[PDB]
Symmetry: D2
Subunit: 260 residues, 4 copies
């Protein structure tokens, strides 16, 4: 069997076992993929977390805001997979926005330094990861990022919505670069997933926002099940979406296709 | 293995071995799907074409404007697949517009009876086939139709564009109905593919503007496409369709997947 | 000044005095436009309604499904407005879908005869009116039709959503044709209005909530003014396009 | 007479008399508007330029990255228009992106410091101008920003394209804020106009020819055609958005591009 048999795939963004990346990595491993992982803050804790995947996988440090980490990344990855071997797949599952650009804090009170850091990590970094990894990627490869539909404004998401709008633009441009390698670049726009990234009058906004997805989705939406979005990322890492790039696949129960 | 191992799938739209439906069917079978084929007019001709598939598949007559072919369809399919078996997949790959609604004929000169026949067959029938077949589809199933991105106007495509716009809208409503059965409904928006569908339109536009316009439209696709586009190769779109028929896109419905080389994401 | 000072404008769609088209006509006359009106079936009743407009306006019969009505339309319009004069504007404010394609009736149970009539009246007719009228329009002119955002599916609206999706596509192509004459073609996607045309209430009440500046289903005049903005020379570079007069509801998730 | 009669409108982004903002300001004054103008850096020569406007208007220095230009903006506007008078209109016609993110420079070589500056000037500033001026705006007022359709990627526009995608997102959130004041917020997505900033994009030595093919392609795809030398159709569109005639549209985008974006070719 194995949708990803033989593929060498870099998966970023594991922080907890509820991380979307954790489930992406699990499903990928279940589908015969050979993985390499990157982690940001507390690598020791992440190692214990990543010890719970179905199989072993090298874990490397990557602070996406660090020039040196990015500069060194491709070399460190070739070490881990073996010289003369290249990546078939790259997963960007990283996002951040300071608290000030987030929930109840007034949209207008988020300082640019805070917004800029959010855009760096959640949007720009998608291009910088591509810059680093494209040199060590095989023809027919696949870059996949994580998106939340920013086409309309909403409560609480605030400046992360802007970052995702920026990220979507970046993706279309990465696709132009990636095509030179016969590599695709796409985003998976997920419904809300109960993650540790994801408070009274603001918690009221979040729940109504959440309850909306399952109501609008013709096939429903389960906030506590990360695996349909995991599967969707693997569909795109696979050879079965060979003619789609610079695009957005919506793994959201169909909520975005329905007004109510 | 087989992406579609054990799946029973209905595929409509085979007319030539260059039909998108032909290639969708070839890949499905290659991936272990058990198929039922529906064909429109010249069934003896379609049979010889479907004879070219790598595995047997019964062929059933379906004229999608014939309410009687639709009434009997679920019954005829169940006969073919076996009592107590249902479908997991359905492929709508049918389209038509009178000459009058396309190519060189002025947009304004298409009479409504023509436009309406094209809309019946190209857009409305997606709902028809879904109404007929949902009763005999399994939970986790999938309905897929073929789209050509009508979000902007363009030369020659004319009233087929208007029909695809209706198709897209119809798809969102079919998804609402299909959701009740645990079934998905989606469109694949294909880049241009060398099939025989455009033959008389392209042939009749030879010395004319819009013949040139159609050629320009086609040549610019591979230019726009960040990974390129090959009109002679229907297999990347046949795979995209198989992908939506598989269990690997389980959270997408009412939606459109673009199998066009990324062309629609690029201005130039 | 007068936003529509000296312009000759055709307005279809008036069947009652709460028709969006009645309000378009009223605001247009207040703005100095000289109108020609078209009516469908109850022409004697329609004249009674149109007498309540500020100024007079010739009323012409127009069944959009009638081939001869369409072929004579331009001649009948030019008779009305007088020799040497031409239209500067056309308002398409017509729509119909059999009950079978709407509301409570199952989406699958709408026969195609019903769907096809609805698309004939609601979408194709936008092309036929432009076909009829463009030969007697001035450059700089403007054709405007009425939309209701069909980009997402929704309860009740059903096959009329499909009709509007069709209409948006027809508009892009009408724009191609009208540009050959220096004329613009655009749609106004309006929020829901209390006009004569369970979930219906839930859906419509979402508008005011979603709209950053609110939405009043009982007030037609904001949308009428929008139509007039597009009939004017103040949007001279927009065609094949859609203007949203919905309080901004379509730009917000909740 | 006049679409904008008796309205007080701030117009930013005048650099030359070919600036889109110069034409918005000229059209607005011809329609009866009473203006306050802001200028970025060459203030002495911006004054000489704004002297070419049909009527005199106060000029205020505004650098959109400068915290105290923004903190003092409302006070300085209020002095200009006179106490107890508020604005009815605000026009954001500003944009910048460092050369690294801007043309034939490879997309991957623009440093994030360069990208962040462009996003700051071209996008965030729409929010900071709104934050500043909404407290001095009347109900029924209008904030307008300038856009170039970023829904598709393209040669040359590069990271400015990313900036515009963020700008469109920011506009939707500004509308929620503006809503509370009875004020609308919208963008005008303009077609290409021969402007000082356009010279920052094109060139490849190749600038004249790249501009020929731009004009030819745009005009061709636009059903009503397109003239890059004429900013007045886009100016009229901004004025239309500042008037009372689009009263039910916010968080939205009006395309003044000859209809090119509705057409594939
Ligand atoms: N959970 C959801 O509702 C949902 C829905 C749609 C999209 N997304 C997006 O999916 C992605 C994954 O988020 P999640 O929900 O799994 O949350 P998460 O907290 O599990 O993952 C976020 C990751 O970003 C990483 N990160 C932060 N700063 C970094 C930096 N400087 N360098 C490298 N990594 C850094 C964190 O270590 C963490 O692993 C994000 O891009 C998020 O915006 C999430
Ligand atoms: N070929 C392309 O470049 C292209 C691109 C995008 C989308 N599409 C779409 O793909 C689908 C298949 O097109 P194609 O290129 O394979 O052309 P095709 O001729 O191979 O397929 C069209 C099929 O529709 C069938 N059909 C017509 N009227 C029917 C009716 N009355 N009842 C039942 N069947 C009927 C025909 O018999 C034929 O089998 C169409 O929906 C088309 O619009 C094609
Ligand atoms: N009221 C709303 O909530 C709303 C919102 C968005 C869009 N619209 C659209 O605005 C337009 C105007 O409708 P309305 O809301 O004023 O309701 P309405 O009932 O007053 O208007 C419908 C008009 O269409 C005309 N018509 C029907 N068949 C015709 C034919 N055969 N030939 C000529 N005319 C025919 C009717 O006579 C009537 O005057 C419609 O297209 C509608 O879809 C309405
Ligand atoms: N020219 C076009 O083809 C075109 C098309 C669509 C949109 N636009 C947009 O319209 C707006 C105006 O550009 P233009 O084409 O008139 O060019 P322009 O060069 O005439 O004006 C751009 C303005 O941005 C200002 N600016 C730069 N940094 C600033 C800062 N830190 N603080 C305050 N102001 C600053 C400059 O002073 C200048 O006045 C821009 O937002 C641009 O993206 C232009
Ligand atoms: O990008 C994300 C989207 C959602 C969905 C959501 C959005 C808004 C309200 C409730 N849920 C949940 C988590 C997301 O990721 C993040 C959000 C904030 C931060 Cl700081 C970091 C991440 Cl990775
Ligand atoms: O829907 C179709 C789209 C394209 C791509 C295309 C569109 C426009 C110009 C050139 N190529 C090619 C064939 C298509 O299918 C048809 C076209 C006309 C007819 Cl009559 C029937 C079909 Cl099935
Ligand atoms: O096109 C229309 C949209 C709405 C608003 C609406 C739409 C969907 C659900 C609730 N309200 C109201 C009336 C509309 O017009 C019509 C609808 C049906 C018919 Cl038969 C005729 C018209 Cl003119
Ligand atoms: O935002 C702008 C869009 C266009 C249209 C365009 C875009 C791409 C190629 C040619 N023309 C032209 C100028 C624009 O503004 C700017 C461009 C670069 C800079 Cl550095 C600054 C501005 Cl304000």
């Amino acid at each position: 069997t194995g949708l990803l048999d033989g593929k060498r795939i870099l998966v970023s963004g594991i922080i907890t076992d509820s991380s979307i990346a954790f489930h992406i990595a699990r499903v990928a491993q279940e589908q015969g993929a050979q993985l390499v992982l990157t982690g940001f803050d507390r690598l020791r804790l992440i190692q214990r977390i990543t010890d719970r995947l179905p199989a072993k996988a090298p874990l490397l440090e990557l602070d996406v805001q660090n020039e040196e980490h990015l500069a060194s990344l491709a070399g460190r990855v070739t070490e881990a997979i073996g010289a003369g071997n290249k990546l078939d797949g790259v997963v960007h599952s990283i996002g951040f926005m300071p608290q000030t650009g987030m929930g109840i804090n007034p949209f207008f009170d988020a300082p640019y330094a805070d917004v800029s850091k959010g855009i760096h990590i959640s949007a720009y970094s998608y291009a910088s990861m591509a810059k680093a990894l494209l040199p060590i990627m095989n023809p027919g490869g696949s870059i996949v990022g994580m998106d939340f539909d920013p086409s309309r404004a909403m409560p609480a998401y605030n400046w992360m919505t802007v970052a995702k709008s920026a990220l979507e633009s970046v993706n279309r441009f990465v696709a132009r670069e990636a095509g030179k390698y016969g590599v695709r670049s796409n985003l998976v726009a997920a419904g809300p997933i109960r993650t540790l990234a994801m408070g009274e009058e603001a918690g009221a906004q979040i729940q109504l926002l959440e309850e909306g997805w399952d109501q609008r989705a013709p096939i429903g939406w389960n906030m506590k099940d990360a695996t349909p979005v995991a599967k969707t990322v693997c569909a795109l890492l696979s050879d079965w979406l060979p003619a789609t790039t610079g695009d957005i696949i919506y793994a959201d129960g169909g909520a975005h296709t329905q007004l109510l």
